[PDB]
Design a protein around this ligand. Structure first.
Ligand SMILES: CC(C)[C@@H](NC(=O)[C@H](CS)NC(=O)CCC[C@H](N)C(=O)O)C(=O)O
Ligand SMILES: [Fe+3]
Length: 330
């Protein structure tokens, strides 16, 4: 009845945009400490206009129509859209499934992009609603991709320094022309009555909207409304992550755990059921399809690892399928 608050420090990441190397190292230390503890931190002083993000996302969610949702739907909901595994609309099912969302990928994945031409898995051309019906939405959303890409680049410099590397150790694989990163614009609704079929129950009795998992990402860069919902598993049990709709919640995904030999673990976390209208807006920091980082271990004098190199595209395609199998099609 007294779930403890998780330690989730607020780290001023602004030095990671600049050229003060000592200041950057002090930020890197804070990232290291958070990554070794609960595995979460809030990035503050990140430079992104999150109120405007929330506003523009709200305008999209509260004006998309049922017709548009079918017309944008991913393959899981619309068999006519065989090319849409990742990008498009993820429908709710009233009475059964409350959440709904819209996912988009790299705006540079155009019809003439070489990976689109090659039909390489996990690369897709984004689908968008009609401009007249959603004026400004596509432009805003594409610009948001680049704003959060920029923040993520800076965060990756911090993680690299934290791990004893040069600052471009990760960021050199995180490029505008080929990143597999995605934005998801998630709506969690208020519903009265709320369908019990859309509520899961954890082993400890907690009511959930999304079960325990580790992220399929290098890092995850998340903005949410100010409604508490996330919990992180620690040695002391599940602990509540306090909401902060001015900051970005950051954690590592399982690709970071792999390449650090679990020195930076991918924290296990879950989403509590809350009957409230809220937004959840993750950016999944994914590398390029052929990106391979040689695994290492910063706990060992020679840094040698017992893990094999894994290309990012292989990791991602299989990880996304496995997460659907484990925790359901969202
Ligand atoms: C905890 C939040 C990040 C959010 N959960 C999520 O977004 C969950 C768990 S990290 N993520 C996923 O299902 C993976 C979506 C990947 C996306 N379709 C893509 O093709 O790249 C939630 O609010 O439920
Ligand atoms: Fe997650």
């Amino acid at each position: 009845g007294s779930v403890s608050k998780a330690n989730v420090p607020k780290i001023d990441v602004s030095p990671l945009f600049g050229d003060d190397q000592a200041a950057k190292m002090r930020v890197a230390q804070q990232i290291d400490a958070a990554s070794r503890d609960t595995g979460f931190f809030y990035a503050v002083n990140h430079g992104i206009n999150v109120q405007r993000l929330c506003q523009k996302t709200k305008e999209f969610h509260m004006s998309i129509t049922p017709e548009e949702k079918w017309d944008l739907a991913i393959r899981a909901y619309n068999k006519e859209h065989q090319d849409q595994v990742r990008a498009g609309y993820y429908l709710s099912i009233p009475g059964k499934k409350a959440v709904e969302s819209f996912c988009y990928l790299n705006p540079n994945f155009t019809p003439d992009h070489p990976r689109i031409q090659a039909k390489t898995p996990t690369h897709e051309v984004n689908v968008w609603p009609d401009e007249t019906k959603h004026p400004g939405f596509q432009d805003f959303a594409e610009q948001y991709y680049w704003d959060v890409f920029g923040l993520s680049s800076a965060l990756l410099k911090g993680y690299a320094l934290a791990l004893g590397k040069e600052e471009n150790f990760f960021a050199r694989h995180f490029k505008p022309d080929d990143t597999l990163a995605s934005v998801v614009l998630i709506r969690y609704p208020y519903l009265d009555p709320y369908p019990e079929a859309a509520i899961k129950t954890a082993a400890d009795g907690t009511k959930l909207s999304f079960e325990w998992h580790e992220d399929v990402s290098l890092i995850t860069v998340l903005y949410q409304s100010n409604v508490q919902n996330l919990q992180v598993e620690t040695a002391a049990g599940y602990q509540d992550i306090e909401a902060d709709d001015t900051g970005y919640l950051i954690n590592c995904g399982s690709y970071m755990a792999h390449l650090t030999n679990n020195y930076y673990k991918a924290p296990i976390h879950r989403v509590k059921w809350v009957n409230a209208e809220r937004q959840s807006l993750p950016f999944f920091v994914n590398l390029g399809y052929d990106s391979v980082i040689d695994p290492f271990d910063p706990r060992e004098p020679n840094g040698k690892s017992d893990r094999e190199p894994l290309s990012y595209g292989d990791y991602l395609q299989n990880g996304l399928v496995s997460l659907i199998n484990k925790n359901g099609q969202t």
